[PDB]
RNA sequence: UGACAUUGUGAAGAGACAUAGUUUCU
RNA sequence: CGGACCAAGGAGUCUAACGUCUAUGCGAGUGUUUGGGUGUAAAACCCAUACGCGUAAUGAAAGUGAACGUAGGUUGGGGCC
RNA sequence: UCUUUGUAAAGUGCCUUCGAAGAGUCGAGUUGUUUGGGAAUGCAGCUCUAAGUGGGUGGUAAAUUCCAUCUAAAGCUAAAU
RNA sequence: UUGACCUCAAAUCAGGUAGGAGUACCCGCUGAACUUAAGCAUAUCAAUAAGCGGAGGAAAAGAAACCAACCGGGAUUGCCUUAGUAACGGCGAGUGAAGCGGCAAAAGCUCAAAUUUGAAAUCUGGUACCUUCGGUGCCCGAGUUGUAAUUUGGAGAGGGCA
C-alpha cells in the first residue's frame, strides 16, 4: 500500500504537455537532446499527409 | 502524547488494521473486463439496447426536489395510460415499478408521453423468423435524455401587491407555531358552560 | 376449507380443548425418543403453509431440546480473565431451541434438506418441535420444478447456516433502519466498514 | 524521497538527532491523548480550550439535508445571470420586462443582504429571505416571489 | 391538503396539480371478510373462553371496565390491545347473558 | 430461600360482588 | 560496562489524517483517474452528473444573518504625483 | 426442414357480487448479550401473550386525537461484490 | 374364521443418499488475553485470535411489515460520498453508523389460505416396447388427514355483457 502512482493536475498536466509541444521547434533543444538534426530542411518538419 | 499546538486528530487504526486494506491494483483491470462485459452483452443481446426505459421521476427530501432524475419502472398508471400492459410493456425494453405511485399530473403526463415516443421510436421484430437485422442502438437512456423541466421565462412584468414576503415567512412560522395552543383556547372556550 | 379452521383453533391454546390435548400430546412424545420420525404433520395446517406437501419425498421428523440458558461449561465456574467476562449464569446463547431442533434431526437425516419446522409443545423441562424435511434424489421432487430447487447443491444443511426461517430471524436478516448492523450480514457488514480501501490515485 | 531525508544526513552520529541524555524510548507521555486532565493540562487549557465536557441537547438521527439552505448574498447575485445575458438587463431596467432568477435553480436557499446592487428591478424567486435581501430588492424596484 | 407554496409554514409545499391515486388492496389486509367473520365466530363458542378471559368478564361485572383494562393491560401486552379486549368481553356479555 | 412455569381431580374449612357460588389459599 | 580477531548481514521505515513553510496549476473558485469514453492497453489522451473543500456568521436551540458614511475617523507607513 | 400441438391456452373493455392473505407468533415484562441506537439497536432465555377499519414502522418514556408509510410471523432468484 | 386400517418393527429386501478432505474468499456458533487508558475494575484491543458446525464458484442479500416527511423515492449487492459526522463513552482513553446524491450491475417472481366435485384432472416405482438426460401402454403403490389446474395483494376470483 505504498503510494505507487501519482496525482498530477489535470490543468498543470496541460502545460506540461503544451511545453514539451512547444520546444520541438527551437532546433536548439532538439539538438541539445540527442538527435542529429543538423541536416533536415526546417523546423517544425512537416511532411506530405501522403505518409 | 500531547504536545504543540496541532489539531486533535482521530486516526481510528487500533484494531488489527493492516489485515483490512484494499489496494485497487485492479482498477485498470477491471474497467478493461467491464468494458469487454458490455461488449459481449451488447453482442449477445442482438439489435436490443443494453438498458431499459427508465421514467422521470422527482428526487426526495427538501434537498434534491428541485431536480428530476431517473426513476426505477413506469407505475401501472403510466404503462396502462400510454396503451399497453405492464406484462408486455417488459418484453418491450421498458422498466415497470409495481410500487411507485402517481399523484403529481406533470410527471405523470411526463411519462405518459415519454412512453409515447420511446414507442414510436423503436420497430418490433416479429415472433416468427426474418430477423431483419437493424443494428443496435446502444443506450435508451441517451436516445431518450431525461431534461429538467422548464419552470418560467427569462423576463416579466415586476408585481409588488407589497408585503414583504420576509414577514409572510415570519407570519406563517408563527401561525404555526400557535396554531395547538390557540386550539386549546377553543375547547377550553367552547366548554365554557 | 378445514384447514382455515384449524388455523384458527390453534390460536386457543388456553382453551379446555387444546389444552387437554396439548397435555395429553405432550406426555406421548416424551416417551418417544429425542428424535423420532412422525407418521404424518400433527398440525397439518401448519406444515402445509410452511411448505409442506402430501406427497412421497417429503419428511416429517419430530424433536425435543431442553429449555433454559446456556450454562457457559468452563470447569469449576472458573473463567480465567477480567470481571465483564466472569459470567457463568446468566448467559442465553444467540440461536432459537428451534434452531437446535432443526440441526440436531438434519444431521440425524443427513441425506434430507431440512425445509422448514415449527413449534408443537412443551413442558419445563423440554419444547417439541416437527421439522419438514425434503428428499431431494427422490424422482417426486427432483423433477416438481415448484421444490427442485432445494435439490440445488448450495441448500446442503441450510439449516446449520442459518438459512431456514428461523436461522434468517436469529441472523437478524430484514431491512431496515432497526436493522443496520445484521442485514446484509453481520460479519460480512463489520468487515466492510473496516476495510481501509486505498486507490492508486489516493484521494 | 529518501534521498532528502534528513536521516540520510544523521549517519555516523551515535544517536540519531535525538539527544544522548533524553534518548528516544517508545511512549514517554503514553499513548494518544492520555492524561488531558493531568501531565499534558496545561496544553489542553490553551491550544484546546473548551475540550472536556458537555454542552447543548443530543439529537437523535439528525439527516443533515433537512437543514439544506445554502446562503447567496445581493452582494453576488446579479451573477446568477449568464454574462452576456447579465448587461443586456443591467441597461433596460423596467417592470414590464424584468430578469426572473430561481436563485432555487442555482442551488440556494436564502438570500442574504451583504450588500447594493444596481438599481435594476430583479425578481428573485427564493425560499427564504432576510429582511434588508428583500428591502434592498425592492429599493431597486424588485420582488421577492417565495417558493418551494 | 393542497401545499400552501411556500417553505414554511402549515401546508408548506410546492403547488402541483394532484392525481390521488388508484387504491392498493395491500393498504386493505386487516380487513373483515364474512368468510373469517364466520369461521372465528364459529370457533369462540367451539373452544370458548380462556382463564384469564373468564377472570376478566367476571372482573367487569364486579369492578368495572377500568380495574378490566389495567388487569388486561398487565395480562396482554399493550393499554390498546387491552382497550380491544375489554371492548370484546363486555360484547361477550352483553349479547349473551342478556337479550 | 422466595416467586412464576411444569400443575391436574376430590372433600372439609377460611376468604369477596356485600349470607345464592365462578374464584383464591390452609 | 561492551569489545580476542576478520568478513558478510545489521537500526527513524511505510501508511491514514494533520501543523508550519516552500515550489507549481488555476482562482471565487478548485479537485480528469468512483465512473464513462478511448487506446500502440495497468501507460498516455478525453469527459457527463454529482461530491468534497472554499465562498457566512452566530446561538444549547427555535432562529436570525453583515455599507450612517467615497466600506468611516485618527496616527505612523513604502511607493507614486 | 418434419410434425400442427387445438373443438387447446393467453391478452384486453364494461357491469355485478366478492375479495380468503401465515400464532406460543406479533407484542409485553424481566434477564443476559450486543449495537452509534441514547427511558433500551439487534439477538436469545424464562413468564405473559394479541388482533382484523387489524398489524408493524415513524431514532425521548406516558395518556388522548390525528397523519404518513409499508403488509411480518412461509419461499426462489442472474449480474455488478 | 377371514380381510382391512392405524401405529411400530425386521431383512446381505429394490434403488439411492450422508460421512472425509480442503477451507484464500463465504453462512453461522463460540470466544480470550497481551494491549491502550501513562495505575486500574467500566471501556479498549475485539463483536478480533484460538475452538466448533456448514456451503459455493462465489457465498450471502434480495422484489419492502423499506426509505422517508419530499413536488416524495421504490428488490438486493458493491463503489464514490454522506463522516471521523448524528450518536455511544470512568462523556475519559477511545469509539462510531444511516437516509438522500453520482456511479457499477440490473430482473424478476411462488406458496399457504378456494368445491375439480359432471367425475385425483396429480405422482414414485415395476414391467414391455421405443426414436433412452426422456415417451407410450399396462400393473402394484402414493395421495382425499388433499396430489393437479386456477389465484398471490402489483392483486385476484364467481357471475353477466361486448
Ligand atoms: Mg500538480
Ligand atoms: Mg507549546
Ligand atoms: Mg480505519
Ligand atoms: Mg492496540
Ligand atoms: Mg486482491
Ligand atoms: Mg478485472
Ligand atoms: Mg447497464
Ligand atoms: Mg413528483
Ligand atoms: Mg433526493
Ligand atoms: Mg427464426
Ligand atoms: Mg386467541
Ligand atoms: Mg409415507
Ligand atoms: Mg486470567
Ligand atoms: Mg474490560
Ligand atoms: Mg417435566
Ligand atoms: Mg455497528
Ligand atoms: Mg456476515
Ligand atoms: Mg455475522
Ligand atoms: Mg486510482
Ligand atoms: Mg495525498
Ligand atoms: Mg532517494
Ligand atoms: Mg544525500
Ligand atoms: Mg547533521
Ligand atoms: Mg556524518
Ligand atoms: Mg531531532
Ligand atoms: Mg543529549
Ligand atoms: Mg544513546
Ligand atoms: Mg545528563
Ligand atoms: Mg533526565
Ligand atoms: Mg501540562
Ligand atoms: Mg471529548
Ligand atoms: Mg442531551
Ligand atoms: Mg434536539
Ligand atoms: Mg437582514
Ligand atoms: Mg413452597
Ligand atoms: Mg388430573
Ligand atoms: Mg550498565
Ligand atoms: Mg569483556
Ligand atoms: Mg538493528
Ligand atoms: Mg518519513
Ligand atoms: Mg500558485
Ligand atoms: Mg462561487
Ligand atoms: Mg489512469
Ligand atoms: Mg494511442
Ligand atoms: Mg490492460
Ligand atoms: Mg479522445
Ligand atoms: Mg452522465
Ligand atoms: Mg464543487
Ligand atoms: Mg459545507
Ligand atoms: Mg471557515
Ligand atoms: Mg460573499
Ligand atoms: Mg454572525
Ligand atoms: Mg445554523
Ligand atoms: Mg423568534
Ligand atoms: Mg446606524
Ligand atoms: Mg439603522
Ligand atoms: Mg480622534
Ligand atoms: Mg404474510
Ligand atoms: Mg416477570
Ligand atoms: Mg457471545
Ligand atoms: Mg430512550
Ligand atoms: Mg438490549
Ligand atoms: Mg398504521
Ligand atoms: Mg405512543
Ligand atoms: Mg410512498
Ligand atoms: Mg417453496
Ligand atoms: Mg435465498
Ligand atoms: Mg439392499
Ligand atoms: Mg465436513
Ligand atoms: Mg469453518
Ligand atoms: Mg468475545
Ligand atoms: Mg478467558
Ligand atoms: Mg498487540
Ligand atoms: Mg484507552
Ligand atoms: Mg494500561
Ligand atoms: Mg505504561
Ligand atoms: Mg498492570
Ligand atoms: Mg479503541
Ligand atoms: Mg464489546
Ligand atoms: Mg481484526
Ligand atoms: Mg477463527
Ligand atoms: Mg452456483
Ligand atoms: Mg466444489
Ligand atoms: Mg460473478
Ligand atoms: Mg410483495
Ligand atoms: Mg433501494
Ligand atoms: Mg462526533
Ligand atoms: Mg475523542
Ligand atoms: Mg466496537
Ligand atoms: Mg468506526
Ligand atoms: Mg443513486
Ligand atoms: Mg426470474
Ligand atoms: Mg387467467
Ligand atoms: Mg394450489
Redo the contacts with the bound molecule.
Keep these: 500500500?505504498?503510494?505507487?502512482?501519482?496525482?498530477?493536475?489535470?490543468?498543470?498536466?496541460?502545460?506540461?504537455?503544451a511545453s514539451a509541444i512547444a520546444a520541438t521547434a527551437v532546433a536548439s533543444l532538439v539538438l541539445a537532446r540527442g538527435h542529429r538534426v543538423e541536416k533536415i530542411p526546417e523546423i517544425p518538419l512537416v511532411v506530405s499527409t501522403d505518409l | 502524547?500531547i504536545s504543540?499546538?496541532?489539531?486533535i486528530?482521530?486516526?481510528?487504526?487500533?484494531?488489527?488494521?493492516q489485515?483490512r486494506?484494499?489496494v485497487?491494483?485492479?482498477?485498470?483491470?477491471?474497467?478493461?473486463?467491464?468494458?469487454?462485459?458490455?461488449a459481449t452483452?451488447a453482442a449477445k443481446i442482438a439489435p436490443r439496447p443494453?438498458?431499459?426505459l427508465?421514467?422521470?421521476?422527482?428526487?426526495?427530501?427538501?434537498?434534491?426536489?428541485?431536480?428530476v432524475?431517473?426513476?426505477?419502472?413506469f407505475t401501472?398508471a403510466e404503462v396502462?395510460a400510454a396503451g399497453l400492459?405492464?406484462?408486455?410493456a417488459?418484453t418491450i425494453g421498458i422498466?415497470?415499478?409495481?410500487?411507485?405511485?402517481?399523484?403529481?399530473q406533470?410527471?405523470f403526463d411526463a411519462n405518459v408521453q415519454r412512453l409515447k415516443e420511446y414507442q414510436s421510436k423503436i420497430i418490433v421484430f416479429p415472433r416468427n423468423?426474418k430477423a431483419p437485422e437493424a443494428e443496435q442502438v446502444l443506450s435508451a437512456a441517451a436516445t431518450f435524455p431525461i431534461a429538467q423541466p422548464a419552470?418560467d421565462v427569462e423576463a416579466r412584468a415586476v408585481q409588488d401587491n407589497g408585503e414583504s414576503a420576509?414577514r409572510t415567512?415570519?407570519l406563517a412560522?408563527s401561525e404555526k407555531?400557535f396554531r395547538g395552543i390557540r386550539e386549546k383556547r377553543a375547547r377550553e372556550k367552547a366548554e365554557a358552560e | 376449507?378445514?384447514?382455515?379452521?384449524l388455523?384458527?383453533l390453534?390460536?386457543?391454546?388456553?382453551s379446555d380443548v387444546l389444552?387437554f390435548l396439548q397435555?395429553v400430546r405432550?406426555?406421548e412424545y416424551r416417551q418417544?425418543?429425542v428424535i423420532?420420525?412422525?407418521?404424518?404433520?400433527?398440525?397439518?395446517?401448519?406444515?402445509?403453509?410452511?411448505?409442506?406437501?402430501?406427497?412421497?419425498?417429503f419428511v416429517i421428523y419430530r424433536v425435543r431440546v431442553?429449555?433454559?440458558?446456556?450454562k457457559?461449561?468452563?470447569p469449576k465456574g472458573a473463567?480465567?480473565?477480567?470481571?465483564?467476562?466472569?459470567?457463568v449464569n446468566?448467559?442465553?446463547?444467540?440461536?432459537?431451541?428451534?434452531?437446535?431442533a432443526e440441526?440436531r434431526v438434519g444431521?440425524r437425516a443427513?441425506?434430507?434438506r431440512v425445509?422448514?419446522s415449527?413449534?408443537?409443545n412443551?413442558?419445563?423441562?423440554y419444547?417439541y418441535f416437527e421439522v419438514i424435511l425434503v428428499?431431494?434424489?427422490?424422482?417426486?421432487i427432483?423433477?416438481?420444478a415448484?421444490?427442485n430447487?432445494?435439490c440445488?447443491?448450495?441448500?446442503?444443511?441450510?439449516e446449520?447456516?442459518?438459512?431456514?426461517?428461523?436461522?434468517?430471524?436469529?441472523?437478524?436478516?430484514?431491512?431496515?433502519?432497526?436493522?443496520?448492523?445484521?442485514?446484509?450480514?453481520?460479519?460480512?457488514?463489520?468487515?466492510?466498514?473496516?476495510?481501509?480501501?486505498?486507490?492508486?490515485?489516493?484521494? | 524521497?529518501?534521498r532528502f531525508?534528513?536521516?540520510?544526513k544523521?549517519?555516523g552520529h551515535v544517536?540519531?538527532?535525538?539527544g544522548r541524555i533524553g534518548?528516544?524510548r517508545?511512549?514517554?507521555?503514553?499513548?494518544?491523548?492520555?492524561?488531558?486532565?493531568?501531565?499534558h493540562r496545561i496544553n489542553?487549557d490553551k491550544y484546546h480550550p473548551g475540550?472536556?465536557?458537555?454542552?447543548?441537547?443530543?439529537?437523535?438521527?439528525?439527516?443533515?439535508?433537512?437543514?439544506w439552505?445554502?446562503?447567496l448574498?445581493?452582494?453576488?447575485l446579479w451573477?446568477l445571470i449568464p454574462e452576456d445575458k447579465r448587461d443586456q438587463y443591467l441597461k433596460s431596467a423596467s417592470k414590464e420586462t424584468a430578469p426572473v432568477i430561481d436563485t432555487?435553480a442555482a442551488?440556494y436557499?436564502?438570500?442574504?443582504?451583504?450588500?447594493?446592487i444596481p438599481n435594476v428591478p430583479v425578481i428573485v424567486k427564493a425560499r427564504?429571505?432576510?429582511?434588508?435581501?428583500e428591502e434592498?430588492i425592492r429599493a431597486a424596484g424588485g420582488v421577492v416571489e417565495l417558493?418551494? | 391538503?393542497v401545499?400552501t407554496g411556500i417553505?414554511?409554514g402549515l401546508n408548506?409545499?410546492?403547488?402541483?396539480t394532484?392525481?390521488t391515486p388508484?387504491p392498493?388492496?395491500?393498504?386493505?389486509?386487516?380487513?373483515?371478510?364474512?368468510?373469517?367473520?364466520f369461521?372465528?365466530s364459529l370457533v369462540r363458542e367451539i373452544a370458548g373462553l380462556?382463564?384469564?378471559?373468564?377472570?376478566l368478564i367476571?372482573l367487569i361485572?364486579?369492578?368495572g371496565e377500568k380495574r378490566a383494562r389495567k388487569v388486561a393491560?398487565?395480562?396482554?401486552?399493550?393499554?390498546?390491545?387491552a382497550?380491544?379486549?375489554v371492548e370484546?368481553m363486555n360484547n361477550i356479555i352483553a349479547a349473551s347473558r342478556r337479550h
Excluded: C
Excluded at chain 4, 110 to 116: H, S
Design positions: 500500500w505504498r503510494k505507487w502512482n501519482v496525482k498530477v493536475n489535470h490543468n498543470e498536466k496541460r502545460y506540461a504537455t | 502524547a504543540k499546538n496541532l489539531p486528530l482521530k486516526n481510528h487504526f487500533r484494531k488489527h488494521w489485515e486494506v484494499k485497487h491494483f485492479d482498477q485498470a483491470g477491471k474497467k478493461v473486463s467491464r468494458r469487454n462485459a458490455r452483452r443494453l438498458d431499459l427508465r421514467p422521470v421521476v422527482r428526487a426526495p427530501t427538501v434537498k434534491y426536489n428541485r431536480k432524475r431517473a426513476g426505477r419502472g401501472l396502462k400492459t405492464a406484462a408486455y417488459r422498466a415497470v415499478d409495481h410500487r411507485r405511485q402517481n399523484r403529481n406533470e410527471i423468423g419552470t420576509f415567512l415570519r412560522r407555531k | 376449507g378445514a384447514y382455515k379452521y388455523e384458527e390453534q390460536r386457543k391454546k388456553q389444552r397435555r405432550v406426555w418417544k425418543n423420532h420420525r412422525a407418521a404424518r404433520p400433527t398440525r397439518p395446517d401448519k406444515a402445509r403453509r410452511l411448505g409442506y406437501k402430501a406427497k412421497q419425498g431442553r429449555r433454559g440458558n446456556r457457559r461449561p468452563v473463567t480465567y480473565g477480567k470481571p465483564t467476562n466472569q459470567g446468566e448467559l442465553k446463547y444467540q440461536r432459537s431451541l428451534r434452531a437446535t440441526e444431521r443427513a441425506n434430507l425445509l422448514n415449527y413449534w408443537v412443551q413442558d419445563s423441562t419444547k428428499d431431494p434424489q427422490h424422482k417426486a427432483r423433477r416438481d415448484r421444490y430447487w432445494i440445488d447443491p448450495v441448500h446442503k444443511h441450510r446449520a447456516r442459518g438459512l431456514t426461517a428461523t436461522g434468517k430471524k436469529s441472523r437478524g436478516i430484514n431491512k431496515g433502519h432497526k436493522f443496520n448492523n445484521t442485514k446484509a450480514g453481520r460479519r460480512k457488514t463489520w468487515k466492510r466498514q473496516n476495510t481501509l480501501s486505498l486507490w492508486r490515485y489516493r484521494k | 524521497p529518501s531525508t534528513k536521516t540520510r544523521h549517519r544517536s540519531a538527532g535525538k534518548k528516544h517508545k511512549h514517554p507521555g503514553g499513548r494518544g491523548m492520555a492524561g488531558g486532565q493531568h501531565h489542553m475540550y472536556f465536557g458537555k454542552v447543548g441537547m443530543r439529537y437523535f438521527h439528525k439527516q443533515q439535508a433537512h437543514f439552505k445554502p446562503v448574498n445581493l452582494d453576488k451573477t432555487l442551488g436557499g436564502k438570500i442574504l443582504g451583504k450588500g447594493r427564504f429571505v432576510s429582511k434588508l435581501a434592498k417558493i418551494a | 391538503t401545499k417553505a414554511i408548506k409545499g410546492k403547488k402541483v394532484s392525481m388508484a392498493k388492496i395491500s393498504y386493505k389486509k386487516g380487513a373483515a371478510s364474512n368468510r373469517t367473520k369461521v372465528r380462556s382463564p384469564y378471559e373468564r377472570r367476571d361485572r364486579n369492578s393491560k398487565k395480562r396482554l401486552g399493550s393499554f390498546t390491545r382497550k380491544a379486549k370484546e
